Design a protein around this ligand. Structure first.
Ligand SMILES: Nc1ncnc2c1ncn2[C@@H]1O[C@H](COP(=O)(O)OP(=O)(O)O)[C@@H](O)[C@H]1O
Ligand SMILES: Nc1ncnc2c1ncn2[C@@H]1O[C@H](COP(=O)(O)OP(=O)(O)O)[C@@H](O)[C@H]1O
Ligand SMILES: [Mg+2]
Ligand SMILES: [Mg+2]
Lengths: 343, 167, 7, 152, 394, 401, 174, 7
């Protein structure tokens, strides 16, 4: 339940390293500022200055320690820490419009960028020229892509768009990985195959996260309708229409429960029961503070999992338009809310 | 001709519903960043219009979007001398629209004034105070006109006395 | 001209 | 300064003839035959005897959302808007509380449509309806009016 | 680095920015402005912390321009002040940038087209006498813009700070009878943005304040797809109005000056230039070409330089061309426009393509002897060494 | 019968009124307005010479750098200009107004928004000040020998402009706009005297600086050589100015020294007053002309017309005509050297003329104009305002589109 | 146009720090060589003083300009003390006492132009600077007193004490 | 340039 105001303006994106010792924010500008956690303080160590435009997505590969950025300048840059400074490495996205999201893969051999060019660019490395060349998946899509998340197989890909849908695609690159194992989503998973397309066509899909099992995917919309598709149950969708302002990002803390946050300026919880086949509102998480009554004084745009992974999370992070970054401790909320339960 | 407390209570709720905004780069031009409600090139990013109204004359129109809101307003004008004073008042409020950051230099057709609220105002300015300005406007405008109608009538007496007194 | 050369 | 060459090529607009324009989807099954909507005789016969709360649900049970036709929508609006205007102001909370979630959202859609073209006293009532449906459904009800791509 | 270990260097030597680096590089090593600044005393400014040399250059001048009287040696591709241009080359080859030994290195350079000859002769005269570079080559900015893009056929559009030139190529065959130069670039825009800001009361008369407006241009100014729609936004709304904070703390506000300044690339009469814009000129350059080559130029329009980085320029350029194709070729047939195949290569790395192409041609020809121009050749022949390139000089 | 048009040149310092057809204006008054210190109380105001003397009123100057800043006052300044001084029913007389070149469009829009809506005039033409000053000079010139081509320097109280004119057409994209004028010269003399000559009451420092400027000041060939002449031989160059206090009615005297040539020097060393400007006017003129087309560079050097009240300084053109001929005879020398010395190019005949009418030059070019029938075609009209709106008067020749 | 700069620099002229150790016509003692001409770096800076204090931009072309700027800054220190004097004999006594004062030098605080001045590296060059300036600080003051004081009253002139508030640009040796 | 334009 911390709150460190890095600045007064928004923070478009953020990413943590493996140790959770460093963080890479974008303070609403063309720069990436890397801050290090010195005791109970925050100190800036590096600043990445290559973009001709605003940044929208960052991801940090934990093992390779290679940061990847995407910005409105139709660019991406893969950064490697050589000595004391970060050096970029060029990317060839081949998009005529601006980028909106980026996520490293689990095995760190590729990443996927979602753009306003009505495409998704699956990027991989090419030592023949030091480039990162990209392949496209733009068969069904008809508008901008806002969020992405990778399946644990390092192949399958989910994508939330402004076409009111959350499609799922197969980002199989033959040159860098062998054919995958089957999944309850389907066996036929060549490059660029629409496995699952949602049915609802009302509201823009802001956030998408896969479950640790890989058999459940949820997506948030501007319609104040969280959703969740289960492949074990023949890709059936369970909605839970909310009675408040929309949400903008989610993540699986467990195989059953989720945590979402957005324009209501706080987190909440959502519980899933495959026996009944529905979602249920697990209540607001943060206690009403002793006008707004929370830590985030504006919206929240990105939620991330620091400790425990999506299998069972102990701490998650929120990053919002109020120039703030709030760390949460899951069990502390279990204790501070005896009514609260995390399934 | 209904009441004023519920009208502003409806408008205030619709505004909180429509100021759920975020930045959004364009998908028709290379790297532009426009308010989509004004340009209207991308139909998918345009929410529905919704109207509120005490009566036929007074009403509000919230045209929302992913990165913009447009709040047109119609004020009640019983007589002709009130149509004049409201028309001038908005002109002198639009002329300073670089200082009212949420303001349009011209109104939507059929309405007397129009606001425009982008995703950069909510990030910088306090979202809940911008609403309170729209609401404070809608309940003070009726008072600030009759205070001018009474000021015109007071002037017309002195201009009569200062002529007839000399006879 | 119309085709070839300008005029 | 001024130019002295033909600048008429900048007037024609080529963006009109574009292939990347958005296209929203419609219900194919409804284009042939439209949903009949709340029949007037059903609701009206329930209004003659004064059973408002049941004529209420009869109007929200049927709703031609999937219909591409606008007249049946307009006829449907005039029916429900005729019903809401005849309610007793004390009975509205009794009726709104009966509805499930998905009826409160459809109600608030019809409410924000009644404000478009009001009669003498069509709006003092709808503002009372708006107060109750908001107390139940909250702001998320309105957002499902804005995001709704299919009008009532 | 060649077989003999000699580093192979690529210097663009532009008019507003120097782009220096080594062959095979996918980025440049250093990118700094081409200005020289001498110290000056001004009453408004008071600083006595940082040492100010008698000759500051590049990034250490533009950063300290408040205490300096900066001056650009180059203007419109041509070199004016050699004594200030050599002080720039030294900084480019010194311990602050590319700490190399010139006597044991090869260099590749660029000159724009239809420039004077004494500007090329005097550079080569300087590299072999002053710095005594081992091997020299003077490339064409157009051909290099294709090597980076991986092409052999494409009409180039290279707009920088002083020069805006257009050079078509077809399968590697130069067509210099079609080369055209517009006299408009990022410096003629930066002046027009001052003349517009002057209406708001902001005065930028000094030589240091010229850079401050460049940063205001690089950040805010852009190009309008449909200029009518942009004028409605400035008349009806006030969203285009941004704010820029200056080094002295004073804040300003910039609105319709964002699309009006760079519109002078398409409506050049706004800066007292008689002629046609970059689109109606690019369409008329193509319509001069042989009729069979025109079909492959529309497909391979290549941009470059940093004056093509205005948000909305390629989209605006695609638009104005199709209006002209419809009006003059098709005579008004909208139905045939769907078959018109045009592709404007607008890669976001188009800011440095003249350099990247120089890294590519160097790595390909680093280890050949009939390509470069040696110190020995210049000692014997003199400026006539340039005949290897086909440039007739005596 | 048929009524002439009203002409108004609202400048920073002085305002020039009258009706068309005449040679000199019917009124010339300062651009001041005296107000008290709700109801009919906004009409208790005076303008012009009736505003300085008023003890219990506060004198306000609503115009700065040629542009208006408080339109609440200028709308009151214009309803006495019409109903008190001119005595014009504005619904009948057309109007001609003046703007500087760098007047914003929004100020042109609020101008027409005032005249057409409030005063209900049937016509309006907002012209450029210094351009009208060139037409006046052509009448002094012989008939038929009129030089359509000419350069204009109009410096008044607020701002100074250089405007070329070639074959009748204005080269708007080469205009320059120097913010130094008679108010900066005055505040610089008002400064030098506060340092040396205490004994000037603060209420009569401005009155004392104009008097020194208009009477004693002049222009020097070289600056530092004048300081010696004032030091080595002081009896000859130092004058004396006896004033009158307005409270005690007792005289006060001062010695007028270095402020005789230091005020006007800011035309040539404007960093004395404004640090945001260094270029002399002798160099601004060379850039204005060398930015113009190659064919009309000679005729523009040959007709440089000084206009405005702040060009009445003694030996102003003699120095400007000399700083240019140095600059022009060198450029031709350098080209003669780079070419090979085979051709001695013709010299350029610089000429800086200072014509008889300056206090009402711009007004005169507006009266000659308004007395034509062509004026009644280019005038924006009440009808055109109701249709197109106040953006009908948005454009000026200084910019395009 | 530009301000008035120094014309006396010649390549044969020695350099101290990054200043111009130029000849001076004085009975005082210091490292400055004695001049024969009727004009020096002092008589110039006193000729150009009244004009150079109005400018607001000065471009350092050479090192002699760094010597002129110092004097032009010290003359504004003379006039602060001289305006209080009632007799030339009292001024010459005040001009002595001021030159003896150890003002700042290039390199140390107090000096307003530490950036565009080069300190002495070795101690010997330091000792030469402090004795060259002190030779200027003394002949400058001695030569002002001939000019400031009107012989009719033997008291300061208003034509010189009006420049007390006019610093060079805005700098001062204090 | 030498003739025409500056450079
Ligand atoms: N983001 C930007 N938007 C517009 N112009 C830019 C931007 N960044 C740089 N520039 C322009 O690019 C120009 C430099 O282009 P370049 O060709 O690299 O150098 P040169 O002009 O010396 O050859 C600069 O004058 C600058 O004004
Ligand atoms: N003989 C003179 N010498 C110098 N300046 C003068 C002389 N006579 C009048 N002036 C100045 O002319 C200025 C006004 O110029 P003018 O153009 O007529 O009015 P405005 O500047 O308001 O347009 C006044 O500030 C006044 O001091
Ligand atoms: Mg270039
Ligand atoms: Mg005037």
């Amino acid at each position: 339940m911390a709150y460190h105001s890095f600045l007064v303006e928004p923070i478009s994106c953020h990413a943590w390293n493996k140790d959770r010792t460093q963080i890479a924010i974008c303070p609403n500008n063309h720069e990436v500022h890397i801050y290090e956690k010195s005791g109970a303080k925050w100190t800036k160590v590096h600043e990445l200055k290559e973009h001709n435009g605003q940044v929208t997505g960052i991801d940090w590969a934990p093992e390779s320690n290679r940061i990847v950025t995407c910005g409105t300048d139709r660019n991406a840059y893969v950064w490697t820490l050589k000595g004391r400074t970060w050096k970029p490495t060029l990317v060839i996205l081949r998009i005529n419009r601006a980028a909106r999201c980026v996520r490293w893969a689990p095995n760190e051999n590729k990443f996927a960028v979602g753009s306003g060019s009505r495409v998704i660019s699956i990027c991989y490395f090419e030592q023949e020229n030091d480039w990162w060349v990209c392949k496209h998946i733009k068969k069904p899509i008809r508008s901008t892509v806002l969020s992405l998340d990778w399946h644990p197989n390092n192949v399958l890909l989910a994508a939330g768009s402004c076409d009111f849908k959350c499609r799922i695609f197969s980002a199989y690159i033959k040159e860098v990985e062998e054919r995958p194992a089957p999944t309850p989503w389907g066996s036929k998973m060549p490059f660029g195959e629409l496995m699952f397309e949602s049915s609802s066509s009302c509201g823009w899909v802001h956030g998408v996260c896969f479950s640790a099992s890989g058999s459940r995917v949820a997506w948030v919309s501007h319609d104040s309708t969280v959703c969740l598709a289960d492949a074990d149950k023949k890709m059936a969708v369970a909605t839970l229409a909310s009675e408040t302002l929309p949400l903008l990002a989610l993540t699986f803390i467990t195989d059953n429960s989720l945590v979402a946050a957005g324009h209501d300026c706080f987190p909440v919880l959502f519980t899933y029961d495959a026996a009944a086949g529905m979602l249920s509102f697990g209540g607001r998480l943060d206690v009403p503070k002793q006008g707004l009554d929370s830590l985030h004084k504006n919206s929240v745009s990105q939620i991330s999992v620091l400790s425990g992974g999506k299998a069972k999370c102990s701490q998650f992070c929120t990053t919002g338009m109020d120039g703030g970054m709030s760390i949460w401790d899951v069990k502390s909320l279990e204790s501070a809310l005896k009514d609260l339960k995390i399934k | 001709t209904a009441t004023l407390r519920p009208y502003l209570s409806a408008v205030r709720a619709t505004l909180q519903a429509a100021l759920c905004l975020e930045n959004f780069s364009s998908q028709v031009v290379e790297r532009h960043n426009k308010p989509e409600v004004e340009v209207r090139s991308s139909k998918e990013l345009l929410l529905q219009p919704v109207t509120i109204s005490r009566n036929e004359k007074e009403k509000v129109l919230i045209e929302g979007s992913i990165n913009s809101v447009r709040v047109s307003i119609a004020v009640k004008q019983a007589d002709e001398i009130e149509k004049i004073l409201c028309h001038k008042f908005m002109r002198f409020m639009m002329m300073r629209a670089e200082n009212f950051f949420i303001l349009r230099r011209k109104p939507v057709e059929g309405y007397d004034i129009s606001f425009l609220i982008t995703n950069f105002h909510t990030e910088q300015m306090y979202k809940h105070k911008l609403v309170d300005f729209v609401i404070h406007f809608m309940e003070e405008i009726d008072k600030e006109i009759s205070e001018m109608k009474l000021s015109v009538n007071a002037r017309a007496r002195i201009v009569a006395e200062e002529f007839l007194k000399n006879f | 001209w119309x085709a070839x050369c300008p005029a | 300064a001024r130019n002295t060459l033909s600048s008429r090529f900048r007037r024609v607009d080529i963006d009109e003839f574009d292939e990347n324009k958005f296209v929203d989807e419609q219900e194919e099954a409804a284009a042939a035959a439209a949903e009949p909507g709340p029949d007037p005789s059903e609701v009206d016969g329930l209004l003659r005897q004064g059973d408002m709360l049941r004529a209420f649900h009869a109007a929200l049970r049927n709703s031609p959302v999937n219909t591409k036709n606008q007249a049946v929508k307009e006829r449907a609006q005039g029916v429900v808007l005729k019903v809401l205007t005849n309610f007793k102001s004390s009975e509205i909370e009794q009726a709104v509380q009966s509805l499930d979630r998905n009826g409160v959202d459809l109600l608030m859609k019809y409410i924000y449509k009644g404000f478009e073209k009001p009669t003498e006293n069509s709006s003092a009532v709808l503002l009372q309806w708006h107060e109750k449906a908001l107390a139940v459904g909250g702001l998320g009800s309105i957002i499902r009016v804005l995001t709704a791509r299919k009008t009532v | 680095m060649d077989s003999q270990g000699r580093k192979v260097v690529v210097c663009d030597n532009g008019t507003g920015f120097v782009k220096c680096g080594y062959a095979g590089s996918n980025f440049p090593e250093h990118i700094f402005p081409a200005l020289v600044g001498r110290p000056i005393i001004r009453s408004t400014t008071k600083v006595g912390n940082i040492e100010i040399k008698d000759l500051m250059v590049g990034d250490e001048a533009s950063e300290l321009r408040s205490m300096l009287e900066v001056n650009y040696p180059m203007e419109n591709g041509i070199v004016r002040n050699w004594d200030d241009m050599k002080h720039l080359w030294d900084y480019t080859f010194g311990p602050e940038k590319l700490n190399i030994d010139t006597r044991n290195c090869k260099i590749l350079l660029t000159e724009p087209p239809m420039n004077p000859t004494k500007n090329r002769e005097k550079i080569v005269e300087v590299m072999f006498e002053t710095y005594q570079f081992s091997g020299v080559y003077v490339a064409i900015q157009a051909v290099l813009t294709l090597y980076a893009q991986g092409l052999l056929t494409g009409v180039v559009v290279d707009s920088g700070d002083g020069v805006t030139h257009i050079c078509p190529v077809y399968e590697g065959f130069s067509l210099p009878h079609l080369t055209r130069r517009l006299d408009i670039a990022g410096r003629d825009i930066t002046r027009y943005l001052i003349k517009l800001l002057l209406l708001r009361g902001y005065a930028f008369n000094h030589s240091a304040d010229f850079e401050t407006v460049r940063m205001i241009k690089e950040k805010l100014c852009y190009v309008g797809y449909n200029i009518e729609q942009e004028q409605k936004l400035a008349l009806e709304t006030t969203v285009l109005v941004e704010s820029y904070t200056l080094p002295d703390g004073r804040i300003i506000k910039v609105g319709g000056e964002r699309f009006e300044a760079p519109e002078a690339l398409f409506q050049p009469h706004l800066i007292n230039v008689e002629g046609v814009g970059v689109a109606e000129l690019l369409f008329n350059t193509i319509q001069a070409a042989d009729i069979d080559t025109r079909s492959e130029f529309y497909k391979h329009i290549v941009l470059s330089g940093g004056s093509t980085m205005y948000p909305g320029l390629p989209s605006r350029l695609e638009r104005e061309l199709k209006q002209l194709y419809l009006e003059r070729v098709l005579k008004g047939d909208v139905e045939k426009l769907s078959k018109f195949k045009i592709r404007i290569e607008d890669p976001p790395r188009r800011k440095h393509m003249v350099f990247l192409g120089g890294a590519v041609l160097a790595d390909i020809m680093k280890d050949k002897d009939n390509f470069w121009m040696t110190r020995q050749e210049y000692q014997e022949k003199g400026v006539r060494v340039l005949e290897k390139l086909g440039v007739t000089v005596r | 019968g048929r009524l002439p048009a009203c002409v108004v040149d609202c400048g920073t310092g002085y305002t020039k009124l009258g009706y068309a057809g005449n040679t000199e204006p019917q009124f010339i008054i300062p651009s001041c307005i005296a107000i008290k210190e709700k109801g009919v109380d906004d009409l208790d105001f005076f303008i012009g010479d009736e505003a300085i003397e008023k003890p219990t009123y506060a004198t306000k100057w609503p115009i700065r750098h040629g542009i208006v800043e408080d339109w609440d006052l200028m709308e009151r300044f214009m309803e006495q200009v019409i109903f008190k001084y001119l005595r014009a029913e504005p619904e009948d007389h057309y109007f001609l107004l003046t703007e500087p070149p760098l007047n914003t469009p929004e100020n042109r829009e609020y101008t027409a928004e005032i005249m057409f809506e409030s005063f209900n005039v049937p016509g309006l033409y907002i012209a450029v000040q210094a351009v009208l000053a060139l037409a006046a000079s052509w009448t002094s010139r012989q008939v038929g020998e009129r030089t359509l081509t000419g350069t204009v320097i109009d410096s008044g109280d607020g701002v100074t402009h250089v405007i070329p004119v070639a074959e009748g057409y204005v080269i708007g994209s080469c205009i320059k706009h120097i913010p130094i004028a008679g108010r900066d010269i005055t505040y610089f003399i008002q400064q030098l005297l506060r340092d040396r000559e205490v004994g000037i009451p603060p209420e009569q420092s401005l009155e004392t600086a104009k008097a020194v400027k208009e009477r004693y000041s002049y222009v020097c060939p070289d600056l530092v050589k004048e300081f010696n002449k004032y030091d080595t031989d002081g009896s000859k160059w130092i004058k004396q100015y006896t004033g009158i206090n307005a409270i005690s009615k007792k005289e006060f005297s001062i010695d007028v020294g270095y402020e005789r040539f230091l005020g006007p020097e800011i035309f040539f060393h404007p960093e004395f007053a404004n640090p945001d400007f260094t270029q002399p006017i002798s160099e601004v003129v060379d850039e204005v002309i060398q930015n113009c087309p190659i064919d009309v560079r000679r005729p523009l050097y040959k007709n440089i017309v000084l206009s405005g009240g702040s060009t009445m300084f003694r030996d102003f053109g003699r120095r400007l005509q000399r700083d240019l001929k140095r600059t022009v005879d060198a450029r031709l020398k350098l080209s003669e050297e780079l070419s090979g010395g085979r051709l001695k190019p013709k010299p350029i005949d610089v000429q800086v003329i200072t014509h008889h009418m300056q206090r009402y030059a711009v007004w005169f070019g507006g009266s000659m104009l308004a007395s034509t029938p062509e004026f009644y075609q280019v005038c924006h009209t009440k009808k055109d305002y109701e249709e197109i709106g106040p953006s009908i008067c948005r454009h000026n020749p200084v910019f395009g589109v | 146009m530009p301000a008035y700069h120094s014309s006396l620099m010649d390549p044969d002229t020695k350099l101290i720090g990054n200043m111009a150790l130029l000849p001076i016509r004085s009975q005082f003692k210091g490292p400055a060589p004695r001049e024969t001409k009727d004009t020096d770096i002092v008589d110039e800076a006193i000729y150009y003083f009244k004009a150079n204090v109005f400018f607001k931009n000065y471009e350092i072309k050479n090192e002699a300009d760094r010597t002129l700027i110092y004097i032009t800054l010290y003359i504004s220190e003379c006039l602060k003390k001289l305006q209080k004097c009632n007799s030339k004999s009292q001024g010459e006594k005040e001009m002595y006492t001021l030159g003896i004062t150890n003002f700042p030098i290039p390199g140390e605080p107090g000096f307003p132009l530490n950036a565009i001045y080069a300190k002495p590296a070795n101690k010997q060059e330091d000792e030469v600077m402090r004795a060259y300036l002190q030779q200027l600080r003394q002949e400058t003051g001695l030569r002002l007193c001939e000019k400031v004081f009107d012989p009719q009253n033997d008291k300061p002139s208003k034509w010189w004490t009006c420049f007390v508030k006019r610093q060079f640009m805005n700098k001062s040796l204090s």
